[model samples]
Target: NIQVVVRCRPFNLAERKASAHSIVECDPVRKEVSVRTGGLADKSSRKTYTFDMVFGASTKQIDVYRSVVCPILDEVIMGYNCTIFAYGQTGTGKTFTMEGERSPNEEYTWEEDPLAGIIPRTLHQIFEKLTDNGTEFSVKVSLLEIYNEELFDLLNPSSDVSERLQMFDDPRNKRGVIIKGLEEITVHNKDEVYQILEKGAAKRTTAATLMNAYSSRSHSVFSVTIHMKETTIDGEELVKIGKLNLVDLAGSENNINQSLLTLGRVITALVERTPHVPYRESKLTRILQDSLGGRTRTSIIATISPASLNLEETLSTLEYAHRAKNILNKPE
Candidate 1:
């Protein structure tokens, strides 16, 4: 089943200095987002959204991780491909929630940092648990950004940022295509993955020079692959693998993207159960097609701002995600 969770960032009380606020509301206990019908204070009507998960602005990075990602991490370790996306309009805290930034004071490691978000936190649990487990396993990761439908390796080693990756369809599997030139670096521990994360984060900042808005307009796909090793009683060794995909999608604005359009279209197709998913419509969809209508489990983090701002955009994101919950995947 596809799960959708709504996380509304708190309106900065200090910035506005207002005690009273409204427009968007979240009740995680009841799993409802009460959105006012109109922008004005008329305040008579509200559309409540009952999502699988809901978080108010008062939510913490830890609980959000514990409430949502903790379980998903378990599924990944069990050899299942899982997808979790951060979807919202601009300035809705999407990037921060997925790829968090460092603080000015160097008090603790990124692993110990309170603000650490999903990707690193998820990476931590993998090595932390598997190392304790008797079974041997493998971990590898890749981070890439889709800017204007072009692939740019965020973890790319070369100085030339101009290089773009080419995608070709794999005949062996009709479902998805293989990215030939994409870089997949092996990571033995959590700290190594943190270094790679910083490298990718710096590279994105480097791109913002010639082209600004590189962070907001781009769709980032960060993937982790896990390989499990087992030995049979007959002396035959068996291998099993699971995958993790976390996509920080472009902010859901008119910037909805030519790539984002196909994502939306793909979701529409899946919700309606159309014969044709048109995954070929966009490279982003092409890469993510496996997560849709397949064995891979999928979920979305529908980030939103406080009630006073971008209610319409929040609703658009919420409805799209709500529609996604209807698309079914078969389980063994």
Candidate 2:
């Protein structure tokens, strides 16, 4: 099972990054949440339609993670294979949206600070939840990067790979993203999880692009697998395998905006509406093909920037998100 939360980028008065200590003010009367975080707090909207919730400039990231992302991941750790990922153009706060910037910085670079991205936040929540599930279950985690058509193990202490490798496709394995030598490591608590995340942060492929400062050059996938056994009321025991897949995709940008001719071509092929689409091209899109284009219990949180400059990419991203939202994950 999977759930999604869409949060709006809040801002200070001048449209800069918000202070980490600030709390987003929720106006009960207007059903609006006023944030003092960062960015432009101009006209925005938020509403829940059926199972999905959409947010405009008026939403805050912390609340969205706690209320939306956290719950879905909590469910996955119990006994399901869940995928939670951000879908949108570059500089839409996809990274900042999931994990708030904890350290102080002038440019609001989230990676510079230790408290960044959803890896730690989600792990903390999962461990806390696991405490209630009892001592029988054990948690394990593995981090890797899919960059330049290669796979790098992020959980490694060195965050260093001896060689470059590409993922393979086995028609027998359900056509999922296949990374060679992906070692699944076990984890016990938040400290160990943070260590893994930190290593990945250092080794993960990032570059400077016109659209984003620390543009994610490659697709990074973090997998958290839980091995547990539950005792039934009749004193019988059952082993349950639950997997949590969290993916942070590269920004979707146009050639004119990002100035990356190659990325534009790659993204164009990624969102194509056809059966012959090559899901193995990028690490991010390939892993999500099942969630977006195939059978998987999935949901997407499409982020967008309100700036007029980002209009085309924003609209295109929303269209792709809509396509994923409407896709039938399994035979109905």
Candidate 3:
């Protein structure tokens, strides 16, 4: 089953000042969730839903990693393609949950800190798992962002947007779609991986919006490719390659929400098994085609706010999550 998890973030300071009421309730054990009106007067307002996993506001970052990301890491090492994406509207904690809270001007190294989020934690886990196996492995990482239907290499700050990046189709390769001129860095250890990520994070597009102070203005994809060489008991040489994609998608909102709209439409088409899959609708979808409906194991974390102040956005996010739950993709 494609893992579809929902996480409700804690209310922010502005929400507290406005006296916002929480309407979402999560049952992590039962994998069930519900959204109800704060007043509890309308019977129809209360709707219960089911997902692969449900995390409430009190859920810790480590717990999220253990349940959501740990299993996927295992699959990836065995030469399977995997993807995990964070989806939500603005101020719903998508960036915080995926990358953690950090100062805009601060530069960070790989360290044990509570503030580090999934990206760093995932990197640590990858190196730890590889070391434990004591197998010879090589790792490479690539970072890119899709903004306003344009693709930018976050690793290279000097990439010109007017010269549009193109997606090339190479059927011989395992990854069906490839972005021409994208930068890929080879790393020997976790420290090198973290350094590349730190460099790219600064170049990512983030801007102030009415909903969030440092909101992600584009969908960022951080992908890792691992190639391992192992000797078999029969004295034969064996090599395995796997890829992991961690996507931090742009916020799904009104005016500046085109990529997300195409993503939703792509999901709908894939779920229905429609003849015409519009992967070319947007650059984001085109780049993620292999991970979405192809041979990759995919998981989506749908972040939402429980506050009544964002009731419309919250409900819409829940509906989007619900629709995503119905999508079935068989992984290779």
Candidate No. with top TM-score: 1
Candidates' C-alpha lDDT:
0.82, 0.57, 0.78
Give model 1's TM-score versus the native structure.
Answer: 0.93
- What are the per-residue Cα lDDT tens digits for candidate 2 across 207-255? 2221133345555567878887878779888877777677666677752
Give candidate 1 misplaced runs (Cα > 4 Å). Answer: 18-20, 39-43, 232-236
Cα lDDT tens digits, model 3, 12-87, are 7888898876788999889987888544455445777889999998888878888988899999999999999998
Error of 1 at 249 (Å): 0.1
Error of 1 at 50 (Å): 0.7
Candidate 1 global Cα RMSD: 2.1
Which candidate has the highest lDDT of all?
Answer: 1
Give the alpha carbon lDDT tens digit for every residue of 1-332 in model 1: 78889888876656367665757878878999888866545447777878899988878888989998888888887778898889989888888788776665897788888888888888888888887555688888998788888888878787456778888888998876888678888888876878888788788888777555877888999999999887777877777688999999988865447788898888889888899888898989888887877777888899887755576787788788788888887532
Residue 35 accuracy (lDDT) in model 3: 85
